[PDB]
């Protein structure tokens, strides 16, 4: 019996993917089963509650972040529960579904209209966040790419739950990246108990997080157009890049073999573990996380016509 | 640690709605936090597993049901996990989102095209189900309106969990209806422990389940165009009808006061409990269920333009 929905954040299920990985012990943490629908419930709850506890955030404090995705939805839920104003800075590319969910939770949306000269809205949204911090008195910037509380939420969140459940040695921990909060915080907790666990980052082809050559990327959730301040690269032992097509095939294989309907970055994870398995020992124990549901990828991954277009994008292999 | 996603069906959270109901003890069972996204995980899992256990369903058995909604999605998930073929009979009114989710799980869809003479597809889908049962050898009809396993799943499911958690006397149990499996099965279990609990059905205005005058109804999930065989009316102590507008206001109030983003029939439940509270004792203990998420109601309940249209439909009150 809970007093709030907040009490059901965390303690997410762990499954073994027996059918998909018959020659390894692969455990998936179902972070998408958080009450808000994604893993971002963890940093949204943790960051806001920490700020309230330490007097940085009061009922009068206006929360700000540039996000069009899962973190915007999570922040909107937590802000509504706590009685806090929230403004999400977004751009015209936001999916109508996410926009409507964020607005349904009563958050404000500040949509930038001016692309930079070469078509992106990235620098425009960075600037808009600073404008709001200049003009809205009593504000708190979630600051997802630099806030230590992001990775700390994952250290105390799924990272702690993983090492309590998977007490046998963890040979590989595999996570997708955007802010790198998840892989930093979870790997830090895992390696306290399993110091020899290898930490494998999965990124989108074209993401600049690990210096890849930028290409047009369709899938949200995985990859970034900046190097996050949160990232400490010496803590990453292997980096696997996956393209949109590969990722989508991974999602479709996971639902076919296991009946788990997960989002794009989970497909990236599946593709990456299939690559990893060609080099590692049979029987290895691999832990990963499934951040969100397939539901908002119906016109991406789960669309056959989109899939065919992504197949055509594989450069020379197309 | 689970071997399958199926192990995470059930044991859903119970919250208290302190803010929405400050003068009563109102407990909500979050059935939408089942892994498939709605309460229909319970009958889908229970019915299929029972059939397999008793030799009515084997790997060669083709599952059939007429459903465009939550039960189709749940059946598709369970069928995929179990390795079973599924055909959902639907009509042109199916939402594109639900259609895409059911197809993503690998289920077959049989969409009827011929309305009857007065515009509905109800009799056409009833006939299509019998045609498939005539022409597909080795089939099993889920038969949601008449299958005893539907209400049994809820007796063993949330009903059992409710009486284990809420050991204090339950004064009112409030549930929405379509097949009446939920209210029948859950009330039967509740009244073993709390024989004086009053059982309150919440239906859509215009639904024929309790003999209301049919009107055009927008919201899916609640109400039916037949009297379910499953229903035993002597077990229902009070019936509250709610219209589309009322239900939508209930959803919007629940998310505003509690940060819970739930679907149409949850709004019906909220509207009905607000009515109930005008007659019952202050401080009463009320238990209810929240069957699904707000996510597929973004162009219904959570659309301001749709809400205004429903406001205009309230007959003389408009
Ligand atoms: C947040 C997110 C990630 C990446 O997590 P970070 O902690 O930001 O590195 C991957 N997939 C999805 C769907 C996400 O929401
Ligand atoms: C199934 C369903 C109901 C009604 O439940 P029954 O057991 O069929 O009476 C109400 N709301 C939603 C969203 C449902 O999926
Ligand atoms: Mg002010
Ligand atoms: Mg970026
Ligand atoms: Mg045959
Ligand atoms: Mg009907």
Neighbouring-strand partners of residue A28? A15, A288
Residue B183's alpha-carbon distances to A155, A318, B152, B173, in angstroms, are 42, 55, 11, 9
Q: Nearest Cα to B78, choosing from B50, B109, B112, B110?
A: B50
CA distance B38 to A98: 20
- Whether residues B26 and B60 share a domain: the answer is no
Q: What is the token pair recorded at A174?
A: 């595999």
Cβ within 8 Å of residue A80, ≥6 positions away: A105, A106, A107, B255, B256, B259
**Torsion over CA: A91, A94, A99, A101 (sign):** negative
Concatenating the DSSP letter of every residue in A134-153 gives HHSSSEEE--TTT-HHHHHH
State the DSSP code for B268.
H
Q: Nearest Cα to B62, choosing from B50, B75, B73?
A: B75
State the DSSP code for B208.
T
A313 part of a folded domain: no
Pair B28, B257: CB distance under 8 Å: no
Phi and psi of B174, rounded to 5°?
-120, 120
Concatenating the DSSP letter of every residue in A148-213 gives HHHHHHHIIIIIHHHHHH--S---EEEEE-SSSHHHHHHHHHHHHH-TTPEEEEEEETT-TTTTPP
Q: Nearest Cα to A292, choosing from A268, A273, A311, A257?
A: A268
Using alpha carbons only, what angle is made at residue A227 by residues A224 and A230, rounded to the nearest 5 degrees? 105
CA distance A176 to A268: 7
B151 part of a folded domain: no
Q: Nearest Cα to B222, choosing from B18, B38, B17, B7?
A: B38
A153 part of a folded domain: no
Ligand in nearest proximity to the CA of A180? 1
Local structure of B265: helix, strand or coil: helix
Among A93, A117, A144, where does a domain finish?
Answer: A144
| Experimental approach | X-ray
Q: Nearest Cα to A185, choosing from A207, A164, A208, A162?
A: A162
CA distance B78 to B145: 19
Ligand in nearest proximity to the CA of B136? 5
Phi-psi region at B113: left, alpha or beta (left = phi > 0; alpha = psi -120 to 50): alpha
**Ligand 1 pocket residue status of A73, Cβ below 6 Å:** no
Which A residues in the span 86-115 are in contact with B, Cβ-Cβ below 8 Å?
97, 100-101, 104-106
- CB-count exposure of residue B209 (10 Å: 0-12, 13-18, 19+): buried
Cβ within 8 Å of residue A48, ≥6 positions away: A57, A63, A75, A78, A79, A82, A84
Cβ within 8 Å of residue A273, ≥6 positions away: A21, A26, A174, A286, A288
Q: Whose CA is nearest to atom 11 of ligand 2?
A: B221
- Whether residues A105 and A174 share a domain: the answer is no
State the DSSP code for A31.
G
Cβ within 8 Å of residue B309, ≥6 positions away: none
Helical ranges in chain B per DSSP H: 41-53, 70-82, 96-104, 122-135, 148-154, 160-165, 181-193, 244-258, 264-277, 304-311
Tokens 């800075």, located at residue: A89
Nearest CB to A2 within list B5, B14, B302:
B14
Pairing of strands A139-141, A108-111: unpaired
Neighbouring-strand partners of residue B172? B198, B286
- Resolution, expressed in angstroms to one decimal: 1.5
- How far apart are the two ends of chain A, measured CA to CA in Å? 54
A73 part of a folded domain: yes
Distance B49 CA to ligand 5 centre (A): 21
**Torsion over CA: B59, B62, B66, B69 (sign):** positive
Name the domain count of chain A: 2
Breaks (C-N over 2.5 A) in chain B follow: none
> In chain A, what's the furthest Cα-to-Cα distance?
57
Angle between helix A70-82 and B244-258 (nearest 10): 80
- Whether residues B120 and B184 share a domain: the answer is no
Pairing of strands B198-204, A285-289: unpaired
Q: What is the CATH number of the domain that holds A57?
A: 3.40.50.1100
Phi and psi of A16, rounded to 5°?
-100, 135
Exposure on the CB side of residue A57, measured as CA atoms within 13 A:
21
Query: What is the span of the domain harbouring residue A101?
Result: 34-144
Pairing of strands A25-29, A14-16: antiparallel
Pairing of strands B86-90, B108-111: parallel
Among B291, B296, B300, say which to mutate for ligand 2: greatest number of ligand atoms within 8 Å of CB.
B291
CA distance B139 to B63: 6
- Whether residues B234 and B265 share a domain: the answer is yes
Residue B69's alpha-carbon distances to A93, B59, B88, B93, B148, in angstroms, are 29, 24, 10, 11, 20
A188 part of a folded domain: yes
- Whether residues A10 and A69 share a domain: the answer is no
- Whether residues A64 and A6 share a domain: the answer is no
Cβ within 8 Å of residue B88, ≥6 positions away: B65, B66, B67, B68, B72, B75, B76, B102, B107, B108, B109, B110
- Whether residues B88 and B104 share a domain: the answer is yes
- Whether residues A5 and A51 share a domain: the answer is no
B153 part of a folded domain: no
Phi and psi of A240, rounded to 5°?
-120, 125
Q: What is the token pair recorded at B145?
A: 């309106």
Q: What is the token pair recorded at A100?
A: 């409507």
CA distance B174 to B289: 8
Pair B273, B175: CB distance under 8 Å: no
B248 touches chain A (CB under 8 A): no
Q: What is the token pair recorded at A190?
A: 């895992």
Using alpha carbons only, what angle is made at residue A218 by residues A217 and A220, rounded to the nearest 5 degrees? 100
Among A90, A119, A144, where does a domain finish?
Answer: A144
CA distance B139 to B128: 14
Residues of A in contact with B94 (CB under 8 A): none
Exposure on the CB side of residue B247, measured as CA atoms within 13 A:
31
B176 part of a folded domain: yes
Q: Nearest Cα to A27, choosing from A268, A258, A297, A231?
A: A258
Chain centroid, CA B131 distance in Å: 26
User: For chain B, what is the radius of gyration of the CA atoms?
Assistant: 19
Distance A187 CA to ligand 4 centre (A): 22
Distance A63 CA to ligand 3 centre (A): 12
> In chain B, what's the furthest Cα-to-Cα distance?
57
Which letter, b or e, does each residue of B176-190 get, where b requires 16 or more Cβ atoms within 10 Å of its Cβ? bbbbbbbbbbbbbbb
- Whether residues A165 and A295 share a domain: the answer is yes
- Whether residues B10 and B135 share a domain: the answer is no
- Whether residues A111 and A170 share a domain: the answer is no
Q: What is the token pair recorded at B241?
A: 């009808």
- Whether residues A16 and A72 share a domain: the answer is no
B292 touches chain A (CB under 8 A): no
User: Chain B: residue nearest A99 by CA?
Assistant: B298
Cβ within 8 Å of residue A86, ≥6 positions away: A62, A63, A64, A65, A75, A76, A79, A107, A108
Cβ within 8 Å of residue A167, ≥6 positions away: A193
Phi and psi of B89, rounded to 5°?
-90, 130
B312 part of a folded domain: no
Residues of A in contact with B303 (CB under 8 A): 100
Residues of B in contact with A13 (CB under 8 A): 2, 5, 7-8, 35
**Torsion over CA: A201, A205, A207, A208 (sign):** positive
Pair A150, A181: CB distance under 8 Å: yes
Pairing of strands B198-204, B238-242: parallel
- CB-count exposure of residue A169 (10 Å: 0-12, 13-18, 19+): exposed
CA distance B278 to B300: 28
Cβ within 8 Å of residue A132, ≥6 positions away: A64, A87, A89, A110, A139
């Amino acid at each position: 019996c809970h007093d709030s929905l907040l009490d059901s954040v965390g303690q997410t299920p762990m499954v073994q993917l027996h059918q998909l990985f018959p020659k390894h012990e692969v455990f998936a943490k179902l972070e998408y089963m958080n009450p808000g629908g994604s893993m971002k419930d963890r940093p949204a709850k943790y960051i806001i509650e920490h700020g309230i506890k330490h007097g940085l955030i009061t009922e009068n404090t206006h929360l700000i972040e540039s996000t069009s995705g899962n973190l915007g939805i999570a922040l909107a839920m937590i802000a509504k529960i706590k009685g806090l104003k929230l403004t999400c800075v977004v751009d015209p590319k936001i999916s109508p579904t996410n926009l409507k969910i964020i607005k349904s939770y009563g958050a404000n949306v500040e949509m930038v209209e001016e692309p930079d000269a070469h078509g992106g809205y990235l620098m425009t949204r960075i600037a808009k966040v600073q404008e709001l911090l200049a003009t809205i008195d009593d504000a708190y910037w979630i600051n997802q790419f630099a806030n230590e509380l992001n990775w700390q939420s994952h250290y105390h969140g799924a990272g702690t739950e993983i090492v309590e459940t998977i007490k046998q040695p963890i040979d590989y921990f595999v996570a997708p990246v955007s802010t790198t909060g998840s892989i930093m915080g979870m790997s830090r907790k895992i390696k306290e108990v399993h110091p020899n666990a290898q930490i494998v980052a999965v990124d989108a082809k074209g993401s600049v997080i690990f210096g890849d050559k930028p290409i047009n990327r369709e899938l949200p959730g995985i990859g970034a157009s900046r190097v996050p301040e949160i990232l400490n690269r010496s803590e990453i032992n292997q980096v696997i890049h996956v393209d949109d097509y590969q990722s989508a095939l991974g999602c479709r294989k996971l639902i076919d073999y296991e009946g788990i309907f997960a989002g794009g970055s989970t497909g990236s994870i599946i593709a990456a573990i299939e690559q990893l398995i060609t080099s590692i020992e049979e029987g290895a124990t691999i832990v990963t996380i499934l951040p969100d549901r397939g539901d908002r990828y119906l016109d991406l991954v789960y669309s056959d016509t989109w899939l065919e277009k992504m197949k055509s994008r594989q450069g020379v292999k197309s």
